[PDB]
Design an enzyme around this catalytic site. Structure first.
Site, PDB file in Angstrom:
ATOM      1  N   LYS A 158       0.841  -1.103  -0.026  1.00 60.75           N
ATOM      2  CA  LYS A 158      -0.024   0.201   0.196  1.00 60.75           C
ATOM      3  C   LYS A 158       0.958   1.472  -0.143  1.00 60.75           C
ATOM      4  CE  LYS A 158      -3.865   0.457   2.179  1.00 60.75           C
ATOM      5  NZ  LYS A 158      -5.306   0.069   2.405  1.00 60.75           N
ATOM      6  N   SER A 159       0.228   2.126  -0.479  1.00 60.51           N
ATOM      7  CA  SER A 159       0.968   3.625  -0.781  1.00 60.51           C
ATOM      8  C   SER A 159       1.453   4.253   0.749  1.00 60.51           C
ATOM      9  CB  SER A 159       0.029   4.840  -1.102  1.00 60.51           C
ATOM     10  OG  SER A 159      -0.950   4.986  -0.505  1.00 60.51           O
ATOM     11  N   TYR A 210       2.849   2.446   3.257  1.00 61.77           N
ATOM     12  CA  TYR A 210       4.113   1.962   3.405  1.00 61.77           C
ATOM     13  C   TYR A 210       5.195   2.392   2.513  1.00 61.77           C
ATOM     14  CZ  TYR A 210       2.005  -0.230   7.456  1.00 61.77           C
ATOM     15  OH  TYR A 210       1.798  -0.705   8.669  1.00 61.77           O
ATOM     16  N   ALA A 211       4.929   2.255   1.198  1.00 59.30           N
ATOM     17  CA  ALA A 211       5.680   2.590   0.144  1.00 59.30           C
ATOM     18  C   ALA A 211       6.453   3.788   0.058  1.00 59.30           C
ATOM     19  CB  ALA A 211       5.235   2.123  -1.351  1.00 59.30           C
ATOM     20  N   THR A 213       2.769 -15.235   3.715  1.00 59.24           N
ATOM     21  CA  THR A 213       3.806 -14.782   4.592  1.00 59.24           C
ATOM     22  C   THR A 213       4.067 -13.174   3.996  1.00 59.24           C
ATOM     23  OG1 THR A 213       4.824 -16.998   4.910  1.00 59.24           O
ATOM     24  CG2 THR A 213       6.523 -15.059   5.009  1.00 59.24           C
ATOM     25  N   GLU A 224       6.670 -10.102   3.942  1.00 58.12           N
ATOM     26  CA  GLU A 224       8.107  -9.660   4.133  1.00 58.12           C
ATOM     27  C   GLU A 224       8.028  -8.210   3.953  1.00 58.12           C
ATOM     28  OE1 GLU A 224      10.379  -8.008   2.142  1.00 58.12           O
ATOM     29  OE2 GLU A 224      12.303  -8.020   3.225  1.00 58.12           O
ATOM     30  N   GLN A 271      -2.361  -5.007  -1.135  1.00 57.39           N
ATOM     31  CA  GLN A 271      -3.564  -5.324  -1.933  1.00 57.39           C
ATOM     32  C   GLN A 271      -3.235  -6.473  -2.866  1.00 57.39           C
ATOM     33  OE1 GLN A 271      -6.810  -3.289  -5.001  1.00 57.39           O
ATOM     34  NE2 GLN A 271      -4.823  -2.165  -4.904  1.00 57.39           N
ATOM     35  N   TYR A 296      -0.960 -26.136  -8.093  1.00 60.07           N
ATOM     36  CA  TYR A 296      -0.182 -26.281  -6.820  1.00 60.07           C
ATOM     37  C   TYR A 296      -0.291 -27.482  -6.102  1.00 60.07           C
ATOM     38  CZ  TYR A 296       2.273 -25.093  -2.612  1.00 60.07           C
ATOM     39  OH  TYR A 296       2.968 -25.124  -1.558  1.00 60.07           O
TER      40      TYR A 296
END
EC number: 3.5.4.13
Length: 171
Positions: free
Chosen positions: A110-111, A113-114, A134, A136, A155, A169
């Protein structure tokens, strides 16, 4: 790309996302502003849970991705995780996923954090994979950085193919 109507359908009819909210949640029970989560126009804003693993380089000399070692992480459980400068942490989502055979997803930070130099790295969810995701977080800044548990961090975008895959998978 699949839409908010489709995401809703898949959550309620096939348990794709659990727990699920059909709309954007932008505030906590108290009215406190949070980093928003929930269904979005063409995706789903996932939440970080409150259990973190903070990388520590103490007593180590090398990061060996083929020999992942729980000993190179400090467990931290709490509302706000502090990532040391120029280092990283792991967490898992509040949300559990069950991906259909026809779907691949990508996941982008999301913006919130970025824009602070915190890069969320999440790998594509494969068809017929199920799990908690998970998360990171690379703190690419030269200060300690906050990650807010129980609030949105990324997102997820959902793609369907024109052909069902031969080997999922699960196969």
């Amino acid at each position: 790309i699949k839409s908010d109507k489709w995401i809703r359908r898949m959550a309620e009819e096939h348990k794709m996302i659990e727990p699920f909210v059909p709309d954007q949640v932008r505030a906590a029970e108290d009215g406190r502003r949070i980093v928003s989560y929930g269904t979005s126009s063409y995706g789903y804003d996932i939440r970080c849970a409150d259990e973190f693993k903070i990388f520590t380089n103490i007593n180590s000399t090398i990061v060996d991705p083929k020999n992942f070692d729980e000993g190179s992480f400090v467990d931290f459980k709490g509302d706000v995780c502090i990532i040391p400068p120029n280092s990283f942490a792991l967490a898992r989502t509040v949300e559990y996923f069950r991906i259909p055979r026809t779907v691949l997803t990508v996941c982008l930070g999301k913006s919130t954090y970025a824009r602070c130099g915190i890069i969320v790295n999440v790998t594509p969810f494969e068809p017929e994979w199920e799990g908690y995701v998970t998360l990171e977080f690379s703190n690419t800044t030269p200060l300690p950085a906050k990650i807010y548990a129980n609030e949105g961090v990324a997102q997820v975008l959902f793609f369907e193919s024109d052909e069902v895959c031969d080997v999922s998978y699960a196969d």
